[model samples]
Target: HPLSLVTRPDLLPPAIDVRESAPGTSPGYVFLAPKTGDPGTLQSGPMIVDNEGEPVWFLPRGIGALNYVTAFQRQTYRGEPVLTWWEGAPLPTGVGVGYWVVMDQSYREIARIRAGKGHAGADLHDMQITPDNTALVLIAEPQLHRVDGHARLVMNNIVQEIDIASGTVLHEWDSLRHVDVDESYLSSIPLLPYDYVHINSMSVDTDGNLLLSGRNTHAVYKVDRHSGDIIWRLGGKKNDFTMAAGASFAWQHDVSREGDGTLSVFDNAAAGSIAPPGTVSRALFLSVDTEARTARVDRSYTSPDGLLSTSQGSMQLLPNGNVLVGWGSHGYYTEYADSGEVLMNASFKDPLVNSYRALRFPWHGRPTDSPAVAGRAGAHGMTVHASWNGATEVASWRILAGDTPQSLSGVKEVPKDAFETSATVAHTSSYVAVQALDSTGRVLGTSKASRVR
Candidate 1:
């Protein structure tokens, strides 16, 4: 059933809900929580529910503002199902205060990343685990003041790739350090000199390039990680590429690469009216020629179900050729078939979760078809995450001793999900054995032998 809508902003509904699932290598789900009333604080707890409206897990995150970045995300970290949210510094003194809470599948903290200080204090925009599997990439939105009379509306934008094992910054990218203020041709956008650049969300392309969404400038830029250069820019004062058909993003956010060569972004078409001009949000998808740096809006929507733009929403291209939209600022979530049919919609569900942002990811890993396993890999005692989804069921697996299929012993389930096992025997003496299991806990079939020296 469709959720009832509440039109008034001040009287918007304050509950949480979910829309249709975004198909992928696996099933996808949504997460929403409450934001505290502080300037940028939100009420944080983990447990984003499903379409059945069931609480999956509860992440106890503290407060942050409407624009404050949540540490929680839907992606995988080191082959494990994980989620993270920011722990911003206490307000009033919003300085020298920001850390990240990274949790494994069981919601246990794996690492507490201290994101360093800001001018007033440090705040977050978004975070992503790099494709290399060893680092974290996050947005740091710092406050700034200008020398000129113009109110400082532009701030710094930085991406820190931290080493998961060492907790050290392996690489860093800062907007102030790279993109010049003069490149922004829209001088009339109200913000001046230095305030907040508002680099909301980003995604790494297949080629390892970074795409950035700048809200204040209403544009997206393709950046090179190696040279720290802006390869191309879209929208705003000066556009270098031919935009996708009908793609005129106003205050855009959450730009992501769809892996299939297409791209998506939340067109925050409208922004704050505090300035001389006001804006409304819109959503869009585009096909682009990255090599030629050209763009075209292939499809777009302003919500046929309702008429409100979001402040910070997201676009996820599901495997089934559909799209899931989280209407920020407007406080609603909806799902649409690839052909633009609305399958489901909900509203006022989560006060904190609303009017902020949204995202989707496969429930576990790749689809349940043929297992994407390679060969018998790994040495004795190495920790590993095992996953599988066959055509109709999951196969059973076991760790064992001895290398060959006939010389192995069965292993037991370790408590608390730890993978730090040590091998006792050498290559020919140790091996991991796995067998398919039936619904009744009976063995159906055994796996090919895996060496573990």
Candidate 2:
């Protein structure tokens, strides 16, 4: 059953329902672009929640009914830490039209990246910085392509490497020229052609080539970076490698290469109208030998409750040997031990809440905004609550109480909580204020004096 907590329509800071972390979970912020079902489920945008589930940051909806925010991750921009994501419109046909947004540690947008003009804006699937400092982006363009001996409008999967500093298209690849429509799992219908190669994920191989995952083809293709030639196909119609028993995956997403010479995929075993009734999705870890032309499943992780997501999911192998799987259609994400034991399981309060992907990364935010405080006076003393949204470096909160705002002085000090901290003053004061202190007790910012009620 879906967690039944009350939904927060405003998505204001401090409106998230969080849970405690399981043992061995990493210390970092959780990144997700929440896909909502109702108009009141907070406008779609990139949301960052702490490991404890408290919302650390959120970017409200920018402009349209089709607006979508996806792929939130911590990446380096020109050598410093920055958050990157895509904000745009998701079409009914499953292609995305939008641009990439890069924000600094202070939550300020530093750069906006997009595909070169004359194509569909950008696909929501991926945006990453290459080792050489260029950005890789996926774009879906609509054009006339010959499919099944007939001309039709099809969404072409295009990948481009852009020079981050200049927005120059350094490299581009078109799926149409390399792969055909007959390779897709979808049976084309007249006037309404199915997307043949739904490119959803991209990774830079150790050799600097591009590893692309095509959802419609159920294949992961490695293409040469300079020549755009299909170096090899791991799965799908044109299989260059033989799969071991029970290693076949269909309608998958997030095909990525691990540093230790393995590939990971989010296998959405169920495809629309094509998946068998009881098919269950899994996070698959595979061992591939390019020289031997063989692939074998090393491990497959599934939800303890058994979930069958029809579309949209991600699989991430964390640095600590833990695997994180996000159930795209089911609105749930889980962290598992190397032994396949479920360590952390969480879900949004709404059943209709879906995310294109979910990731975890260590973040250190120092929001520039002043601290916020609220207080109330009782018979015994004055109680005050303090918080600084998106401030990850705060170590403690100092409360000041005085008869007047100008005379306020430090009265109590308490360790900083994830989003909020509270303290009780020994005496009642009409004016109360909170100051955020860093690890060294230096005052970062102070909240306005709030009258104790």
Candidate 3:
């Protein structure tokens, strides 16, 4: 459902509920783009939440639609830190029509990326930056194809590499030319085309090789970075390796090669409209031997509550060796220790508030906006509260109080607290102003004078 037309600046930063174990879980912010809930709830864009699940910052809604705004992540552009996310319209054909946007630390757009020539709007499925600062994006282009002796419009899955600064197409790959349409599990319908080889994830390795995941075909492929040729297939109809018992994964996402040479994937274990009988979604760790032509499961992390997410999920191997899994379409995210024990579990409560991908990353943001302050007067003194949304460098807060807004002569300083911090002044005052101070005691910005209650 559409959000209420009423404007509430207080609602600028939404609330988050989290449950966690301090020592067991990884240390970083939870980044994701959450959609509307059950057709009637308000929609939200990409946001960063602290370990306590309080929002650090939220994207303004005027820029893009929140629907299928998947693959949100922190990235670097031209050696500077930035945030990137996709925004597009989702088609009933199981593909998206949109482009990806990049924002700087000040929450301002720095660049926009789209598909290469001859392709439609980019798909919201995947976007990543290479070591050289180029962008790798997935595009779902529709084309006329002869299926079952009938001419129909089918979506062609493609990948494009674009120059971040020049906006030039560096390289392009067409999946249809390599992978046959018959390899897909989904069949086409009248007027509505089937999504053959729905590629949802992409990552470039140290050697510049590409790792791609195709959801419809239930396989992960390693493609040559330069020639755009398939190096090998891990699963699906064209299996280059023998699978161990219970290692078969259907309808998966987020394929990444770990430092130890192990591959990780989010296994939905279901295809089409429902999950296979008696199966639940999980994060799978597999060991593959190229010469031996064999692959075996090292570990599979399952939800303790027995949740099954039929579509859209992510898995991240953190620096602490803890695994973070986003239960897409199920509205849950979990942190698991190396031993597969649950360390932290966070939920959005609303079932329809699905996240396409959830991840953990160390972020330091200093928003260009000024700090916010609120004050209340009490019989004993005046309480001043201040916070700078998305500012990670605030170490302390300085307060200035007086009877008039323009003349806040009295000043005091207090150590910084969490998102919202309070300071008690000995004397009551009618006006108060707060300034955010960094570790070096330099003022980054100040809040407008707020009237005390």
Candidate 4:
């Protein structure tokens, strides 16, 4: 069933239903971590789907009020492509206690990164792999102090750079130590910990600095990575650059430096509260002139669904110059051209499904496992089902049948239909197997022959 709590095909199941697909979009697979808002029987996990939203891969697990897997994307590890993500249990205060995962092309875990040197566990907001083989992760730590003559809890936003090879903390920066709490747009309450500087994303700038985004402060900070000093602020109370007509943003995520010497931001217009009027979420591309200290909006892609995402979104600038956006809290993902025309728009199509980030990248998967085959004897004839999970090179299935498993001969061939394919034949043979073939008819993998039941 499409909405079943669990559907096991001995291979895969579709967790996200793609709604729309069009031509002229970029070429790559979409990466997402679909998390459910409710804490019932639904499962949440990191997923990879094709352009039409077909489930290329899914890892379903339990979900709750504060458990999730987010920031699933592709990264390069020592000149090879790998998959990375964060999975853990965050508290009600939105601080996660989890590990960063790195998986190889065979869908095998090569490493799991944990926070060290007496720091809290890594959060799920963001983690980027640097060119020097280091990982930069964010953390929201709680500390109690007397503020305004009373005791208050504060969530200190921290960014730590760790050497991925040795798991050593190389550099650390604390928001509370550098930025004043007076810059917060969110209210500081007594009982709850004040998330004044809710840091979300971090990008390694071209000049070895870091551009960090603060959701609660509504600002992006340029930090000197070596000295851990703030060089300038962009769009908040202490902004240094003069904003143009429509370049200002609030509660943003996924701020990064682009290839064309511009900066891209996922401008999440709404926080927790409702917007004033006519405000919608958008992706902003800004051209910043550092010498003149001015910033202007070069391009903006407003959400076609008018999404005012309160939390967790991403915008990816593809190699072909197209813009891909994942509208957080709404489960809507869209692709747009350079001139602001919507090329392809789609969604998860479920009210409970939401993804932290959606990204597109070319991937080549070659699983170590062989093809799987199951045989059954029906009234009409003997039917054989074949499937291979995470095998992207398969183009067809060749059925082999004979009296003995080793002596089986190829009898029927069928083109790959979906994630699984089937073929029917007469009951002359006692055993059957399957061979996965590529587009040029070369056998990729063969399954162990099974007796007809």
Best by TM-score: 4
Each candidate structure's count of clashing pairs: 58, 0, 1, 0
Q: How does candidate 4 fare on TM-score?
A: 0.94
| Model 4 C-alpha lDDT per residue in residues 188-217, reported as the tens digit of each score | 576788888889899988898999999888
Looking at model 2, residue 28 earns an lDDT score of: 76
Candidate 2 has its poorest 10 consecutive residues by lDDT at 1-10
Which candidate has the highest lDDT of all? 4
Tell me the tens digit of each residue's lDDT in model 3 across 234-343.
89999899997778888999999888778999998876472647789999999988899899999889987788888889999999899999988778888899999888
What would the TM-score be for candidate 2 when compared with the true structure? 0.92
Candidate 3's TM-score: 0.91
Selected candidate, larger lDDT, 1 vs 3: 3
Q: Cα deviation in Å at residue 441, candidate 4?
A: 1.9
Q: How well is each residue in 193-297 modelled by candidate 2, as lDDT tens digits?
A: 468889899999888888999998989999999999999998899889999767888888998889778899889977767466667999999999988999999
User: lDDT of candidate 1?
Assistant: 0.54
Ten-residue stretch with the least lDDT total in model 4 = 3-12
Candidate 3 regions off by >4 Å?
1-14, 37-41, 62-68, 271-274, 376-383, 409-418, 422-426, 438-442
**In angstroms, how far off is 256's CA in candidate 2?**
1.1
Candidate closer to the true structure by TM-score (higher is better), 1 or 2: 2
